[PDB]
Amino acid sequence: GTSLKILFTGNLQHLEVVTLDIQEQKLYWAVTSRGVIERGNVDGTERMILVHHLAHPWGLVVYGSFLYYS
Amino acid sequence: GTSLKILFTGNLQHLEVVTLDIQEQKLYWAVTSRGVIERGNVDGTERMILVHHLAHPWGLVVYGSFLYYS
Numbered sequence: 148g149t150s151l152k153i154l155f156t157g158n159l160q161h162l163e164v165v166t167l168d169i170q171e172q173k174l175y176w177a178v179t180s181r182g183v184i185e186r187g188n189v190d191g192t193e194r195m196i197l198v199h200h201l202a203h204p205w206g207l208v209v210y211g212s213f214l215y216y217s
Numbered sequence: 218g219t220s221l222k223i224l225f226t227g228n229l230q231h232l233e234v235v236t237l238d239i240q241e242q243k244l245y246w247a248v249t250s251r252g253v254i255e256r257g258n259v260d261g262t263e264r265m266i267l268v269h270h271l272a273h274p275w276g277l278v279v280y281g282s283f284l285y286y287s
């Protein structure tokens with residue numbers, strides 16, 4: 148709990164759970180206000196919208212080649 | 218109600234009432250999530266932060282050379 152850091156900020160109103168892909172060092176999360184699932188590097192450099200036109204994403208998890216979401 | 222337009226969007230979360238200075242043609246509004254009062258031209262071009270470190274702005278009005286906020 149020492150080195151606090153802000154990785155991503157902006158249009159993240161109504162954020163949902165955050166998921167880490169350890170094998171790829173990639174963060175995945177869902178934004179309900181825009182209805183998208185975004186991903187980005189752990190260093191806070193890259194960010195892109197991965198899935199569009201969702202209603203209310205609640206859960207998401209990365210395993211092998213796939214992202215599962217509820 | 219004909220020509221709908223978006224002037225400003227960004228770090229507005231807990232947006233409060235808007236107000237207009239007709240003589241100078243600049244909009245004023247307050248953002249509670251950041252505790253600021255901002256200005257902007259009706260053209261939607263110039264935007265800046267006018268007051269800092271507010272707690273929960275509720276009302277504001279511009280008359281003459283002064284701006285009143287509660």
Ligand code: NI
Nearest residue numbers: 163179203204
């Ligand atoms: Ni939710």
Ligand code: NI
Nearest residue numbers: 231233249273
């Ligand atoms: Ni309020």
